[PDB]
Every structure is written in structure tokens, then in C-alpha cells.
Ligand binder design. Structure first.
Ligand SMILES: Nc1ncnc2c1ncn2[C@H]1C[C@H](O)[C@@H](COP(=O)(O)OP(=O)(O)OP(=O)(O)O)O1
Length: 312
């Protein structure tokens, strides 16, 4: 009477129907309900996500050390969403955002809404008010840790010291998720690591996608290589990983990506020390090749094409 796979499929079906699609899924599964997504600005990361970018109407947490590339991403996400004619907001509580660099990553700063809250409650509240107006495609909250409660900011005491900030972030997400779904706005929370920062406790359970950003290399001193791990993903098989270069003053390196993904996917052969594409001499050294691809825009484009074809 028992047929495991048939039994298992009925279970999984019932599992998803009780808690939502993605509640449980095989790892090497392969996605085919394409969603709506905001390209991460990193081709590899987008693939790692399984859906070509950050899902819309979802809560995203991008945690990691400082200077590991979180912001560059989130900014790119913003820029992409704008090109698609979407409106963006930045709840800033760190006062660090460099708008000049932002423009360089393609963000139309002038049309970017910026807010600088007086308290964690206010910050979250301001963000909720914006979200449920349905005019936003994306909203970035800088620094989960800066969401310090009012009582704490204001004088208050050594008593009734509490874990108020976490509960602050819980109640907030509790009601701002439903809205995010209806609205369809993607909310990226930037969590600088140094509970994963007190409020990251609740974020951990409310995020549909959680990215673990790390600084790994240091491609002279041009820029540095980042590695992201999709530790949580309720919309595609989780745990995938991606890598990309962010040069100083520049955002995520396109050519860089292409050179990497092109290599691993065989489109560009890499005789040790010398990169070649369809018999073309690309140059010795990822950089001489990055350059090559930067200058001979025509190549790379066909290689971006070929790689895009082979995947999605
Ligand atoms: N204002 C800038 N000037 C020059 N390069 C920058 C600037 N901002 C970002 N970059 C580039 C070079 C940095 O090595 C790379 C990583 O920094 P960032 O992308 O800001 O890291 P991060 O997102 O992990 O920091 P944060 O803790 O604020 O999130 O981005």
C-alpha cells in the first residue's frame, strides 16, 4: 500500500498549501514560476538566488561585516528598480550613504526618497507608512542596529533594561510584511555585523531571502572581491553562493562577472595565465582580460549573451 514518492509528494503539497509555496523543497530542484524580481546588480548572485534577483514584496536581509559590499548591492538593486521606472526609498539611520557613488552605480538620487528618523520606532513607522502607499518598488533600511528604541535614545535607565529593540523589530515586521506583500515592494534591511545585532533575531524569521555578504579577496589596490551566500531562500533552493568584484569607486564589475562565469561555464577557455575567447587573445591576468572586455565592448556582449542563454 505504501509508495514513498507518491506519499511524499502529497505531503509536500499539503505542506506548501498550509504555509505557502517554498515551505519545503528539494535542493537540486529547478525553478519555473519566474516571480517578479529586482536584479541584484550581480549576475552570479542573481543566479544564486534562483530567480534572477531579489523577489518583490519580500523582506530581504543583507548581513555581513563592514566594507564587505552590502550597500553597493542594495544600491544597485535600487538603481535597477528605478530604470524599471520604480520609485525608491532609503530609511537612513547611519548617515553614511554617499549619493555621489550612488549615482555612479546608476541610481537616480534626485528622485530617491531619503528619511533620517529620530528613533527606531519612527524609522520603521515611516517605512511602513511609505510601503502601504503602494508607490514603492523598493525600500532600503540602513543598519538594523541603528534602530535603537526611543526609550533608549531618550534618557531612560539602568532599570527595565530590556530586549526592547528586538521586540521593536518584531512587531514592526509583523505588520509591515503583510503590507509589503500587497504593495509588492521589496524591503532590504542592511545588517552590519560587528541576536544578529539585536533586531536580527526577528529579521531571521521574517526574511524570505537572507544574504550573507563577506569580503574575501583584494584584487595594485583596485578594489575587492565579495562572496555572498544565500543562507535563506523561501522562493528557491537555498544555500547557493556567488562571487563578484567591486572596484574602488565602481560598483559590481560587469566584465569581471563575465570573465568569471564565462570561465566556469566554458565559453571562455582559460589556459593557465592566459584567458581566451573563441580563439581570441583576451590577455594574461583577469585584469588585462577585464580591460579587454571593457574596451572591446562587442565581445563580452556576445559572451554575456552566450552565458545568459545557457542559464536564464
Ligand atoms: N564612497 C565610496 N568611495 C569609493 N568606493 C566605495 C564607496 N562606497 C563603496 N565603495 C566600494 C569600495 C568598497 O571596497 C566596496 C565595499 O563597500 P560597501 O559596498 O560600502 O561595503 P558594505 O556594504 O559591506 O559596507 P556597509 O557596512 O556600509 O554595508 O564598495
Amino acid at each position: 500500500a505504501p509508495d514513498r514518492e507518491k506519499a511524499l509528494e502529497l505531503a509536500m503539497a499539503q505542506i506548501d498549501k498550509n504555509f505557502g509555496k517554498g515551505s519545503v523543497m528539494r535542493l537540486g530542484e529547478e525553478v519555473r514560476q519566474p516571480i517578479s524580481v529586482i536584479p541584484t546588480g550581480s549576475i552570479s548572485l542573481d543566479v544564486a538566488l534562483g530567480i534572477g534577483g531579489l523577489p518583490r514584496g519580500r523582506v530581504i536581509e543583507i548581513y555581513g561585516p563592514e566594507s564587505s559590499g552590502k550597500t553597493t548591492v542594495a544600491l544597485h538593486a535600487v538603481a535597477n528598480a528605478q530604470a524599471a521606472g520604480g520609485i525608491a526609498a532609503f530609511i537612513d539611520a547611519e548617515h553614511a550613504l554617499d549619493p555621489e557613488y550612488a549615482k555612479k552605480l546608476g541610481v537616480d538620487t534626485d528622485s530617491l526618497l531619503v528619511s533620517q528618523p529620530d528613533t527606531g520606532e519612527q524609522a520603521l513607522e515611516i517605512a511602513d507608512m511609505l510601503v502601504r502607499s503602494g508607490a514603492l518598488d523598493i525600500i532600503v533600511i540602513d543598519s538594523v542596529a541603528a534602530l535603537v528604541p526611543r526609550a533608549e535614545i531618550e534618557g531612560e535607565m539602568g532599570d527595565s533594561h530590556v530586549g526592547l529593540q528586538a521586540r521593536l523589530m518584531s512587531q514592526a515586521l509583523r505588520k509591515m510584511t503583510g503590507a509589503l506583500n500587497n504593495s509588492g515592494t521589496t524591503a532590504i534591511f542592511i545588517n552590519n555585523l560587528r541576536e544578529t545585532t539585536t533586531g536580527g533575531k526577528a529579521l531571521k524569521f521574517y526574511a524570505s531571502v537572507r544574504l550573507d555578504v563577506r569580503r574575501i579577496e583584494t584584487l595594485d589596490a583596485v578594489g575587492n572581491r565579495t562572496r555572498v551566500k544565500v543562507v535563506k531562500n523561501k522562493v528557491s533552493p537555498p544555500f547557493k553562493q556567488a562571487e563578484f568584484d567591486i572596484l574602488y569607486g565602481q560598483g559590481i564589475s560587469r566584465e569581471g562577472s563575465l570573465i568569471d562565469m564565462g570561465v566556469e561555464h566554458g565559453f571562455i577557455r582559460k589556459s593557465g595565465s592566459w584567458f581566451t575567447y573563441e580563439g581570441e587573445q583576451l590577455g594574461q591576468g583577469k585584469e588585462n582580460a577585464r580591460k579587454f572586455l571593457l574596451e572591446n565592448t562587442d565581445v563580452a556582449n556576445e559572451i554575456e549573451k552566450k552565458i545568459k542563454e545557457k542559464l536564464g
